[PDB]
């Protein structure tokens, strides 16, 4: 039933501190209910109740507390949590951080209201994602393959072409209808236009929804921006059977809003001063993915994050690492050499590749090829590190073949055009024509049956 | 007195409640009109602070808070096996059935066991009216599964004399199966007992551990063995393989039942288990059967409410102790004690308590200590004698991938086995990624009697394996400053057999049909051949380097390249296609081929 | 890119009233018939003595034209014609040339990128420098 009871409105602001405003005399505060604030000048803001205690409600104000006042500020308590109007009508539209429209279209008519927090998908109803998506990118489809409904982030150093990679996935991704949710947090306008323009250049724009929060929009709205995106993705996938892909852009600029809120609340700090709940907060984003029984929908997530000081062990990538189905890494050591897309296969993995490949999904050889490509690429890096100290005169002929493998591999397997789509089969054949650099017996990861069917060609 | 107080305040997973005079600390309490489940963490006057095992978003000041007297407790009985439960014991299959939802609703109260199922009960026949009986006495079997006979037993707090025992027949969780009397007071029981998860289920004795916890992985079972009744940790960074070890133990081990505990884990893990385990099969007595019949999952996915991670771990061990009391060699996969410690960080943060290292509460080391030490091999309670055991394996997940982590630092002080995973091996896709330099097992001195009885050749091989694998790293620190030309022939042989033992013994692709599992006979056969090559190659050099007719590693490789290729090929032997005698005969032919080749070099 | 709804509609009214002032300025007599007709939809709301509130309500209601991109392009076209006429004040050009130049601007892709605007900026710099120039060879 609808909430029929008339809304209260309080002037009883009794403190303000950082992004918090503390009400008093509140009649039965509800934890996590939303409050609208009117400032003395008639400006409207919104905020969530973070704590309640007897008559007190601690409200965090999304649009910042600057201009909140202890006498004239009016808080309309809405009486419920942060619901969002959702509809399939949100495809082909663009929204601000808090889900207000910015494409000059009207306010969304709700086909329903959903709780922004979503719900924990029941582990019994969840279906283990296995139907492969070809992204078209050899460094993915060959060695890091993505299942329909996987969650797998793209990690990057700063300034790397990770935007162009995500754009290419949103230009080439498909199975062996489809729709995209896109969200960006703390993005610069010089990149917001790139994403919006790319969905026009790909012709895709009619099947995609962009939630944009820019670096000069309010930082606390970034907390809800990816949650709005996921709530829309749940409506499209689980209510409407759409094969949804969710792009979350700079989870780092989201994580910085967590660190800010944490410091402002005085929460117990984990590594680098992120809140203790950092893992759970990231899970509350990243777990809304994968198929569920009876529903043909399948939320896939490709978060993107700039790793601070390029450090893989930083809390943002590292906690994301524990949650996601493996990770795709983009590297300066490739990008400086103009090797687009600069995806370094070696540190990458996909947890679901194990079941997304082989007969009925991909050619029989694929799993064996992937492992042997890791083996040779890795040994190539090891002999390169040897050559950099002791010179090529210390290397055996086989060690020089592993060095040549790494060179030929990066120039052919990883190197691909920004608009070039390669099938998995073409990627595997490039894999084999590189593996043929060694004698058949040297391919120690591959069984003799696979070698007899696929090595000689 | 009032049965309920009222929510005085809320902050994330913490709810304060007024009018709670006479509450007990760690009492289980319902919160809110929707009847959320929680537990009292602190008392502060006529007022209480409750950790809530569901998300509190939506709770209001002045909502009812209903006491229950009972501490956090689990229903134990028939119909546990094959099920999946959340951290507060709700059976997910029945939630799915009753709600038809994709998600677990807030406020669900579904009974922990399916009280509608008539189970087949077989009373012990030894009991009769007037007989004396005590906690842990098996009053009857229930034929729960084709594998696991459930052995119902008197609750450990209970004692008395048999007033009534039910005849052989079909009964459920509400049917009275037994009635006692003690001190003139009668006590009825159904087939379901209830136990406080924070209280250890007692035993007659905790014995030493002395039978290997057989595991599919070569490197584990050979070089760092776990033992039935022993603890273990698998500290590893993200993507290191610790979860696949945890799967592999559950899929393939000599454990009579497995409790798997998905504490704060990624949701697709539970789906993968529930996808794979009904389809994978063991065999008993000439009947092939689905391994799910010997498991239960406690799940609490990473996005489920933080507090329930604590209740999940305590549920997983309390179930494990229940099956231990039946005499089963239980195993229990504590699938991340760091994500558990992070839940203790959360409650401590809300309570405003003083943190130890990295925000963790000071009692973290004490909670972990009093958890892993619930393992053991035990003389059970009660009269028919049983030797059950719990073996606990904890997938610690160090923040930043660094073992200076406080969860690791505490865990290593408690566990008798360390399987430290290396991210650099996982990057190379070397798996399982066990670092053989830092890993250790304290059980070797007890297990050496079992190896002496069944595998007398093994202790020499295990020693030579560990030594070669250390000598590799001793050589590497030299080679990286001068180049490989500095090596003596003994050192080249050392690095080569280390490369065999690394790439063809320690390496194991556990999803493939051939690396799926590895029997001990296959494992020792592989290692025996590799070390036989080491000793023979070393002997050949030592025999001939006293002369100008000196054998070298290159001479051996050029004469014996096929033998190196055969040695590498040993891993591909498949237990489904090849019998133990067939694999052993192939390995004997490798020993003979090596001997005849070396006899031609010398 | 965007604004608060109050700001956005207040900018729309600003464009409408400005286009009307420019139309009155370039043509106090209704001689530029085809130009005037091509703005009748905006001009009516400002040639009528409507209150600012009434036109703001009509903008919120979608009764006034309200696309700021279209209004800005249309406003720019009129002002870059007005700028021409004003910049040649001592040499008032033919009406047929004005409506011809207007048609060329109406057809143009982007007036800010156009050499038309560049020529007028150069004319403006030269013209504006004279306004306070003292008697001097260069200035003469
Ligand atoms: N034993 C293994 N055999 C083959 N591949 C493995 C093995 N261990 C790790 N890998 C691959 O790496 C992935 C990451 O390891 P996993 O245990 O699943 O993640 P995590 O370390 O975070 O818990 C595995 O799911 C699998 O795809």
Short mmCIF file of N, CA and C and ligand atoms in Angstrom, two decimals, chain A residues 321-322 349-351 354, chain B residues 217 237-245 265-266 269 431-432 508-511, ligand 1:
data_model
loop_
_atom_site.label_atom_id
_atom_site.label_comp_id
_atom_site.label_asym_id
_atom_site.label_seq_id
_atom_site.Cartn_x
_atom_site.Cartn_y
_atom_site.Cartn_z
N UNK A 321 39.43 -6.90 -5.88
CA UNK A 321 40.06 -8.13 -6.26
C UNK A 321 39.44 -9.31 -5.54
N UNK A 322 39.23 -9.20 -4.24
CA UNK A 322 38.60 -10.28 -3.48
C UNK A 322 37.15 -10.53 -3.88
N UNK A 349 43.19 -12.36 -14.68
CA UNK A 349 42.52 -13.66 -14.68
C UNK A 349 41.01 -13.44 -14.80
N UNK A 350 40.27 -14.44 -15.28
CA UNK A 350 38.81 -14.49 -15.15
C UNK A 350 38.40 -15.77 -14.44
N UNK A 351 37.77 -15.64 -13.27
CA UNK A 351 37.36 -16.78 -12.44
C UNK A 351 36.40 -17.71 -13.18
N UNK A 354 37.10 -20.78 -16.72
CA UNK A 354 37.11 -22.22 -16.44
C UNK A 354 35.92 -23.00 -17.00
N UNK B 217 45.17 -32.31 -3.93
CA UNK B 217 46.35 -31.58 -4.34
C UNK B 217 47.65 -32.26 -3.91
N UNK B 237 46.47 -13.60 -1.09
CA UNK B 237 45.91 -12.41 -1.68
C UNK B 237 44.73 -12.76 -2.60
N UNK B 238 44.08 -11.77 -3.19
CA UNK B 238 42.97 -12.03 -4.09
C UNK B 238 43.41 -12.80 -5.32
N UNK B 239 42.62 -13.76 -5.77
CA UNK B 239 42.90 -14.53 -6.97
C UNK B 239 44.06 -15.52 -6.85
N UNK B 240 44.47 -15.87 -5.63
CA UNK B 240 45.58 -16.78 -5.40
C UNK B 240 45.20 -18.25 -5.52
N UNK B 241 43.93 -18.63 -5.44
CA UNK B 241 43.52 -20.03 -5.52
C UNK B 241 43.02 -20.63 -4.21
N UNK B 242 43.02 -19.87 -3.11
CA UNK B 242 42.62 -20.40 -1.80
C UNK B 242 41.20 -20.93 -1.86
N UNK B 243 40.32 -20.29 -2.61
CA UNK B 243 38.96 -20.76 -2.73
C UNK B 243 38.91 -22.05 -3.52
N UNK B 244 39.72 -22.23 -4.56
CA UNK B 244 39.78 -23.53 -5.25
C UNK B 244 40.37 -24.63 -4.39
N UNK B 245 41.33 -24.37 -3.50
CA UNK B 245 41.75 -25.40 -2.55
C UNK B 245 40.55 -25.79 -1.70
N UNK B 265 31.65 -14.33 1.27
CA UNK B 265 32.17 -14.72 -0.04
C UNK B 265 31.30 -14.23 -1.21
N UNK B 266 31.87 -14.16 -2.40
CA UNK B 266 31.19 -13.78 -3.64
C UNK B 266 30.08 -14.76 -4.01
N UNK B 269 30.19 -18.23 -6.01
CA UNK B 269 30.79 -19.37 -5.35
C UNK B 269 29.73 -20.37 -4.89
N UNK B 431 49.55 -23.19 -10.04
CA UNK B 431 48.52 -23.52 -9.08
C UNK B 431 48.62 -24.99 -8.64
N UNK B 432 48.16 -25.33 -7.43
CA UNK B 432 47.80 -24.40 -6.37
C UNK B 432 49.04 -23.63 -5.93
N UNK B 508 49.25 -28.34 -10.58
CA UNK B 508 48.11 -29.23 -10.73
C UNK B 508 46.84 -28.46 -11.14
N UNK B 509 46.35 -28.70 -12.35
CA UNK B 509 45.22 -27.98 -12.95
C UNK B 509 43.88 -28.61 -12.55
N UNK B 510 43.40 -28.28 -11.35
CA UNK B 510 42.40 -29.09 -10.64
C UNK B 510 41.01 -29.21 -11.28
N UNK B 511 40.70 -28.46 -12.34
CA UNK B 511 39.45 -28.62 -13.10
C UNK B 511 39.54 -29.68 -14.21
N1 LIG D 1 44.17 -25.14 -8.61
C1 LIG D 1 43.90 -24.40 -9.70
N2 LIG D 1 43.88 -25.07 -10.83
C2 LIG D 1 43.61 -24.34 -11.92
N3 LIG D 1 43.35 -23.02 -11.96
C3 LIG D 1 43.42 -22.39 -10.78
C4 LIG D 1 43.70 -23.03 -9.63
N4 LIG D 1 43.77 -22.21 -8.55
C5 LIG D 1 43.51 -21.02 -9.10
N5 LIG D 1 43.23 -21.09 -10.47
C6 LIG D 1 42.40 -20.15 -11.21
O1 LIG D 1 42.46 -18.85 -10.55
C7 LIG D 1 41.16 -18.47 -10.06
C8 LIG D 1 41.29 -17.58 -8.78
O2 LIG D 1 41.46 -18.34 -7.56
P1 LIG D 1 40.23 -18.47 -6.51
O3 LIG D 1 40.55 -19.43 -5.43
O4 LIG D 1 39.01 -18.90 -7.25
O5 LIG D 1 40.11 -16.96 -6.08
P2 LIG D 1 40.60 -16.43 -4.71
O6 LIG D 1 42.05 -16.62 -4.48
O7 LIG D 1 40.36 -14.98 -4.59
O8 LIG D 1 39.86 -16.98 -3.56
C9 LIG D 1 40.45 -19.81 -9.90
O9 LIG D 1 39.03 -19.68 -9.80
C10 LIG D 1 40.90 -20.54 -11.17
O10 LIG D 1 40.17 -20.01 -12.28
#
